[PDB]
Design a protein around this ligand. Structure first.
Ligand SMILES: O=P(O)(O)OC[C@H](O)CO
Ligand SMILES: O=P(O)(O)OC[C@H](O)CO
Ligand SMILES: [Cl-]
Ligand SMILES: [Cl-]
Ligand SMILES: [Cl-]
Ligand SMILES: [Cl-]
Ligand SMILES: [Cl-]
Ligand SMILES: [Cl-]
Ligand SMILES: [Cl-]
Ligand SMILES: [Mg+2]
Ligand SMILES: [Mg+2]
Ligand SMILES: [Mg+2]
Ligand SMILES: [Mg+2]
Ligand SMILES: [Mg+2]
Ligand SMILES: [Mg+2]
Ligand SMILES: [Mg+2]
Ligand code: NA
Ligand code: NA
Ligand code: NA
Ligand code: NA
Ligand code: NA
Ligand code: NI
Lengths: 247, 251
C-alpha cells in the first residue's frame, strides 16, 4: 500500500533533468538507467483533457511552441519539440502523456511521485482523468505517491483513490502543519530547502510524518539535511546525490 | 466604502498598476494608474523575509529587480536597495519594491479602490494574511473599496477568518465545473478567470446566481468590448486607459 513505506533518499526531479530535458521520456530513461529509485513528474491536462507530463502553464520554456498548454490539443502538443532546448540530441522528445511516462517508469521498476499540477479550476477533472489512467496502467507492485501544492487536488485525490499515499507540497513549513496534514490526510510534507528548520522537522518527524525537500542539487547540502533528519531530496542531479551518500 | 467592494467594481482595473508603461507593482505604476483616471488597481502581496507585507509578483527577485534569490528569504532593508524599475525603463531607475503601507498611501491619494491579490509563500498563508490585515485595518481608508482575492485556498480561508467583512474573489484559470460549490465553500462574491477560459454559457450562469465575473489580463480593446457585451463585469489590463477609452467611445 503506502508508497512512503518505500521512500528512497533520492528522487529524480522531473526525471533526471540536470542532463536530460525535464519531464520527458528521455529524462525518465536517464533516471532509470542511472539507478534512481523514484522519479517525480508533474501532471496536468491538455486542451482536450488528456493527462500530460509538463510543468509550466505556457509552452515557450521547454518547447519550440507558444501558448497555454491547458488550451492546446494533444495532437498539436505532440508535434512540438520538447527536447532541443536542452540539447539537439533530444530533438525527437515530445511532451509525454501520463500513460507514456508510466510505461517508461515501470520498465525500470521505479516508484512514481506524481505531482498533481492541475490548471487552477480544473482540479477535479485533472485528478479524475489521471486516476483513470493509473488505475488501469500503473503496476500494483510499484510505489505510487500523489502530491500537490493545490488543496482541491489533494481533496480530489483522496476522494477518488483514497488508498494512494498523499504528500502536501509547501514552500515554508506551515505553523499549522499538523492540523493541515491531518485534515488532508497526507503522510508526508514536501518543503522547499530554503525553509528547512531542524527543530520543526524533528517535531514533524516525532509526529510520524515523512519530510522531503526540493530541489537540492548540491551534494554537501543534501548530506547536511539527511543528517538533520530529511527523509528524501528531490534533485535534478540524482546520480550525483546518490554517489555522495554511498561514498 | 471598503465593505462589499464588488458593489463599486469598475469595468477596468489596472493590473499591477498601469504596468504596460510603468514597472509592475511599483509606486510608479500606481501613480500612473491614478493619473490616467483608473478607478481601481490590482497589486500582489507577500511577506519579506522579516515578515513585512510587500508588493511583488514573483517568488524570485531577478525578473523585476537587479536582485537575486527568494523575496520570501530577503529582509526589507535589503529589498529596499534593489532597483525595481530599470528593467522597464531608465526613467524608472529610482523605483523600489513598495511595502503594502507605501502602496496604500499612493492608492488612497487618488481615491482608488484596491483589489489586493494575496500571493503568499506557500505554507505561509495564515501569517501573510494576518500581517496584511494588520496594515489594512490601520491604514486603509474606510471609504474606499477593498477586495481580497487569491488563487490560494488557505489564503481565502484566512481572509474570511480574520476579516470577514471584506469581500473575497476566487482566482482561477479555468471556470470550475463545480464553480457554485467552490464560491459558496470559500464564501466569495466574485470569480476571476483567465481570458482564454471565458465561456459565455458558464459566465451567464454565474452572473445569474449573483456573482461577479472578472478576467485577466486583457490588453486588446476589441476583445474587452466583446467580453463586456457577453456579460463580463471587469477586466484587469496592463493598458487600462486604452481599454477605458474604447468603452467610452464605443458607438
Ligand atoms: O518543481 P516544482 O515547481 O514542480 O515543485 C517542487 C517539486 O516538484 C514538488 O514536487
Ligand atoms: O497576474 P497574476 O499572475 O498575479 O494573476 C492574477 C491576476 O493578477 C488577477 O488578480
Ligand atoms: Cl542545491
Ligand atoms: Cl545526475
Ligand atoms: Cl466603470
Ligand atoms: Cl532570482
Ligand atoms: Cl530606457
Ligand atoms: Cl469583519
Ligand atoms: Cl489581450
Ligand atoms: Mg513538480
Ligand atoms: Mg521555446
Ligand atoms: Mg502563438
Ligand atoms: Mg510509445
Ligand atoms: Mg495578481
Ligand atoms: Mg522606455
Ligand atoms: Mg534604488
Ligand atoms: Na497518505
Ligand atoms: Na530575512
Ligand atoms: Na520620463
Ligand atoms: Na473556453
Ligand atoms: Na494575451
Ligand atoms: Ni502602521
Amino acid at each position: 500500500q503506502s508508497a512512503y513505506s518505500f521512500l528512497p533518499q533520492v528522487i529524480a526531479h522531473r526525471g533526471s533533468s540536470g542532463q536530460a530535458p525535464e519531464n520527458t521520456l528521455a529524462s525518465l530513461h536517464l533516471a532509470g538507467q542511472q539507478g534512481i529509485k523514484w522519479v517525480e513528474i508533474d501532471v496536468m491536462l491538455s486542451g482536450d483533457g488528456i493527462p500530460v507530463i509538463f510543468h509550466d502553464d505556457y509552452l515557450s520554456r521547454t518547447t519550440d511552441g507558444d501558448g497555454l498548454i491547458y488550451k492546446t490539443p494533444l495532437a498539436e502538443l505532440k508535434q512540438l519539440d520538447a527536447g532541443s532546448w536542452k540539447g539537439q540530441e533530444y530533438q525527437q522528445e515530445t511532451i509525454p502523456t501520463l500513460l507514456e511516462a508510466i510505461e517508461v517508469i515501470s520498465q525500470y521498476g521505479m516508484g512514481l511521485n506524481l505531482e498533481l499540477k492541475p490548471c487552477e479550476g480544473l482540479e477535479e477533472e485533472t485528478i479524475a482523468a489521471s486516476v483513470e489512467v493509473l488505475k488501469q496502467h500503473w503496476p500494483q507492485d510499484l510505489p505510487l505517491l500523489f502530491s500537490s501544492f493545490n488543496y482541491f487536488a489533494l481533496v480530489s485525490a483522496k476522494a477518488l483513490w483514497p488508498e494512494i499515499a498523499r504528500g502536501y507540497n509547501v514552500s515554508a513549513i506551515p505553523s499549522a502543519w499538523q492540523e493541515r496534514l491531518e485534515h488532508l490526510d497526507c503522510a508526508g510534507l514536501h518543503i522547499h530547502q530554503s525553509f528547512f528548520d531542524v527543530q520543526q522537522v524533528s517535531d514533524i518527524k516525532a509526529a510520524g510524518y515523512k519530510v522531503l525537500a526540493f530541489t537540492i542539487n548540491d551534494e554537501s547540502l543534501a548530506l547536511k539535511l539527511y543528517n538533520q533528519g530529511l527523509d528524501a531530496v528531490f534533485s535534478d542531479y540524482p546520480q550525483k546525490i546518490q554517489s555522495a551518500i554511498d561514498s
